[PDB]
Amino acid sequence: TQVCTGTDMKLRLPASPETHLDMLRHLYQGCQVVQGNLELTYLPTNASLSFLQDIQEVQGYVLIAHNQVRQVPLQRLRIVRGTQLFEDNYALAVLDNGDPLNNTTGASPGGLRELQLRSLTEILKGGVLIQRNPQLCYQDTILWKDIFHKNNQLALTLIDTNRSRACHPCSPMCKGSRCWGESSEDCQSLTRTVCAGGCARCKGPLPTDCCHEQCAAGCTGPKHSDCLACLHFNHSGICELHCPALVTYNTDTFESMPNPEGRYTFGASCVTACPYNYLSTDVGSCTLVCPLHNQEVTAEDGTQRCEKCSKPCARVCYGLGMEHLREVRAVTSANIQEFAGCKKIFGSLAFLPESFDGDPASNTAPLQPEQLQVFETLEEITGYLYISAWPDSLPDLSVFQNLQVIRGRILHNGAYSLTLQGLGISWLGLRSLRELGSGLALIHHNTHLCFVHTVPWDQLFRNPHQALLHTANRPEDECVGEGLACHQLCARGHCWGPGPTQCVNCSQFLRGQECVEECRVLQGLPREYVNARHCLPCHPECQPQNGSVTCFGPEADQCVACAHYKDPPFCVARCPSGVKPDLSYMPIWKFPDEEGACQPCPINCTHSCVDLDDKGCPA
Amino acid sequence: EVQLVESGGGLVQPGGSLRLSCAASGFNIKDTYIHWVRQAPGKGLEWVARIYPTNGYTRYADSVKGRFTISADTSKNTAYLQMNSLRAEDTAVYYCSRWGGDGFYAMDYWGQGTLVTVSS
Amino acid sequence: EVQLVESGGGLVQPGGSLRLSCAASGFTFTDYTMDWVRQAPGKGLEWVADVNPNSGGSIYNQRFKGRFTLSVDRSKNTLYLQMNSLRAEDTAVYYCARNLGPSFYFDYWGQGTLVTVSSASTKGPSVFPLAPSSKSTSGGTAALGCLVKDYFPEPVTVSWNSGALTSGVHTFPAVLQSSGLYSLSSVVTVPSSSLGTQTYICNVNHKPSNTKVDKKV
Amino acid sequence: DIQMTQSPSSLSASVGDRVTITCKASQDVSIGVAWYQQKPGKAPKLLIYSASYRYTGVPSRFSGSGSGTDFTLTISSLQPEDFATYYCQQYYIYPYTFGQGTKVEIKRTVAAPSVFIFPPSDEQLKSGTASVVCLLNNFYPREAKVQWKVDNALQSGNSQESVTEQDSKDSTYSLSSTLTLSKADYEKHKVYACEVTHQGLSSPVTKSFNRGEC
């Protein structure tokens, strides 16, 4: 997609600094609009970041921190909106880039030399921050009050100039010292200090060089169509103040007709539907969680809806990071009770060391592995799953065997939907898992963990931008040294662990949750019928024949005959005498025929027929 | 007597769907199959489907095999026929009935019925 | 607890106009329709309008067809309402709210703010020391007071003996009386021999005309 | 519009009481009614929706019922914080509408209207704007008539009246009644009077003063 998520990493070090560079090479690959923050952190001088060239707009802020790159490939960035801000104050932050005076000689030790943000035309909220970048030139010769939006001049700025090197002047082809950088490509744009009076925007000094009111990042022609980025919405190349309404009204009655020319609101845009993992809402918002008194429903096209509870809504179970558990860092002895029998979770799940070695001063108990059984009902998670400790008695993640999907609408550090770190364990066992709705999956420092290369990660994602990220685990050469793999019946060798209960799809048949070579149609005593590759008993009257069987479906009339007696149509080991009525007629003393038919008696009581022609009905 | 009540019969397009509904009275569905049956108007009968509401087992006739599905709410004393891929060969007066105790597969309790029609 | 905060209340002359503001606290302004509802002195509630936070598209009561204007400031969790040219028919305390009618019925609310109209200019109080007649003094505890009268607009402030006389003191809500101006009384209950010796003092300020007032009774 | 009236407009209950209020429509609002409280000088809040469903964060004591045109609130046991105004609202027919309001009043024993009368001051004896006053304190319940008389007629419309709203430590009332006249009315009559038609003493505790003998 041309739209991607931003991140939330704000001067935390990477959970794997080694595989951090390639995480960004997936997440931002050819992205044009960032739904979040653009963070560039701890990136070394060798970093081929050229895939960032396509970013046109950021809805959050930009943070470029602690990097040893000489330059940043961001020359296409038109504008930043500041829907979030760094320290609630800043929309562009440049921190601590180069080296902090280590014991290291290298003549180009990184640090950003220049601005080179050659497109940046507007900032709609928040200030600018630059600190401890001793390599940086030209940040001081900028008219930042052209770029700060005229109608929201929250123009705080804190810029460092403590250089440890010289700066020569920018190319004299510029109209004075107004530059991004050193070359004749690198002149600063002006769009507000070359304009006057009613011209809130222009491309030049004339009244014809002015731009339309909806146009933030400048214009080419004078019309609302002619514009390089727009202040409120883009709809189909029209710069609209609002998205078009989804309803038409009577104007007096306010009786309502749906409008097919309506759109939903999503980021900087108006769209006719919400993208795959989001929620559609009655008022036309595309969201992550439903509004209060709206439920997330299983809408027909899979594109979920938030529609209205005409009774009080069902008490769905919150995960960590939502309502009841927003601030709550961990599953513990106290909140594990709140998941008992829950099948969809509204939030995330997290296992830290402190989840299991629970603190007696913050008076919680250490966690028993048996308390984890409360999750075995779980079908779906709206947030993420994070694991950084596990009990040494569990070689696997068995309590999640029934989990189909993790959405990642909430993400760990804004980026990750599944984390499995430092756990030691040998396999995963997640047999039902078939979807990762958004965000990356991280699996690192796991001592014995085999078979992670056998999972068809292809089938779980819904964009070309997500990957599995792995390092410091078990060698897969030492997994063939263990002599084990996925089982013979695992389709293309795809599994979650060792044996017939672990395959992602089965080559032959399913006996309950066992993938098997064949089923007991002929080959044994407990006979099993086939139901579209599943295998099941009847009620036990498919009596073993030498080449056939006796009741196919568990409505016991269906393979060929009966084993001992018939009560038409069904089959039994004895004609029965029930002592509960509903209506005042029990099965009256059903005598066997010679072909075993269980026939009722010909007089109501008193006179004859008790199977032995005796006395066993009352009166 | 013990008795039922049919509902949800009506007029439909061919190829379309209709959901019939049948509630139970004088008993509560646990020793139970619930059936659907239909009459060619003032002529022959045809049996359509059964459900056992106490475990969800279902069976069908060769005319509605792979077209229709029978279903129930075993708490709300009610069973349903989900008819789909409808035909002119479905214009009939529909009826619902019971069995209970398998040695008595004879249909004693029923409701008032409802018409079903399929047309342009 | 979760709640709204209103501003822009005041008074004008007949045919004049004013505007209100409402800011949301404890919840996201972005996900619910927002409302105005008012109490016209001595009644319950009248609905004024609904407005959506996503585009400012809004539905007023027919009492304001072509009269009132709604707007939203989704940049700062806030909304605004413009008023039209009353001769006091639309006099009320106006409250903000947000919606839960799948339709219009409101679950979270604000403290409200005043809009009232009179032809009056700003005026400081006419004053009267509310003695009992000597034909109405008690063989025990009597009452006295001070009337603060024919002033405009609100607020007045009233106290007794520099604020030290709290023992048996009372003050009532103001009446917008038949001259188009405001009045209230403050009163105190005391043993009659102390009233004839330690004769108690009322001490006042009207903030709009800035006039301070004093009296004893 | 559907007019969503309340009743009865004043009713006295104590802390601990089961309490009831009713609500009535001008038209069907069958599952289309909600219920409210508003405390003295505070924001309103929602209590109940679709006649009967209590809302989020609403206290342990609140309930509702009714349908068609006729609706009910009930408080299972009353708190010190319920001495307030109450409403119901409709949400079927535009424009949307409440009613005239109703108070749950604080219940305690009847109390004696302790009453005083002001001949218009020794500084009005100069200034000539005869602003006359009559004063009650210590009375209960809230329900009364006060009004003005001159010689033996009644006078109004140049009159205005105001009261306390209540401290739950006792909650007996004060009232002032005011009458605006001139010095050219002061010489027009002989007697001026104030009617104290309230329950808290076993007679209407009527007050007076003079043109002459004040």
Author numbering:
A (entry chain X): 23 to 126, 130 to 644
B (entry chain I): 1 to 120
C (entry chain J): 1 to 52, 52A, 53 to 82, 82A, 82B, 82C, 83 to 99, 99A, ...
D (entry chain Q): 1 to 214
What's the paper's own text on this?
Human epidermal growth factor receptor 2 (HER2) is a receptor tyrosine kinase that plays an oncogenic role in breast, gastric and other solid tumors. Unlike other members of the EGFR family, HER2 is capable of constitutive activity, initiating signaling pathways without the need for a bound, activating ligand. We present a comprehensive mechanistic evaluation of zanidatamab (previously referred to as ZW25), a humanized biparatopic IgG1-like Ab directed against ECD4 and ECD2 of HER2. Zanidatamab was constructed using the IgG1-like heterodimeric AzymetricTM Fc platform, with an anti-HER2-ECD4 single chain variable fragment (scFv) linked to heavy chain 1 and an anti-HER2-ECD2 fragment antigen-binding (Fab) domain on heavy chain 2.
We further examined zanidatamab in complex with HER2 ECD by cryo-EM. 2D class averaging revealed a core HER2 molecule bound to zanidatamab Fab and scFv. The diffuse background observed on the periphery of the images is likely formed by the multiple conformations of Fc and the second antigen-binding domain of the two Abs bound to the resolved HER2 ECD (cartoon). Our model reveals that the orientation and distance between the Fab and scFv domains cannot be bridged by a single zanidatamab hinge and must belong to two distinct zanidatamab molecules. SPR assay results showed the dissociation rate koff decreased with increasing density of captured zanidatamab and zanidatamab precursor, whereas the dissociation rate koff for trastuzumab remained constant at all surface densities tested. Zanidatamab formed 2:1 (HER2:Ab) and higher order multimeric complexes with HER2 ECD and only trace amounts of 1:1 complex. Collectively, these results support the concept that zanidatamab binds HER2 ECD in trans leading to zanidatamab:HER2 multimerization. Our data suggests that zanidatamab-induced HER2 clusters facilitate a distinct organization of cell surface HER2, and thus a distinctive organization of zanidatamab Fc, that meets the hexameric Fc requirements needed to promote CDC activity.
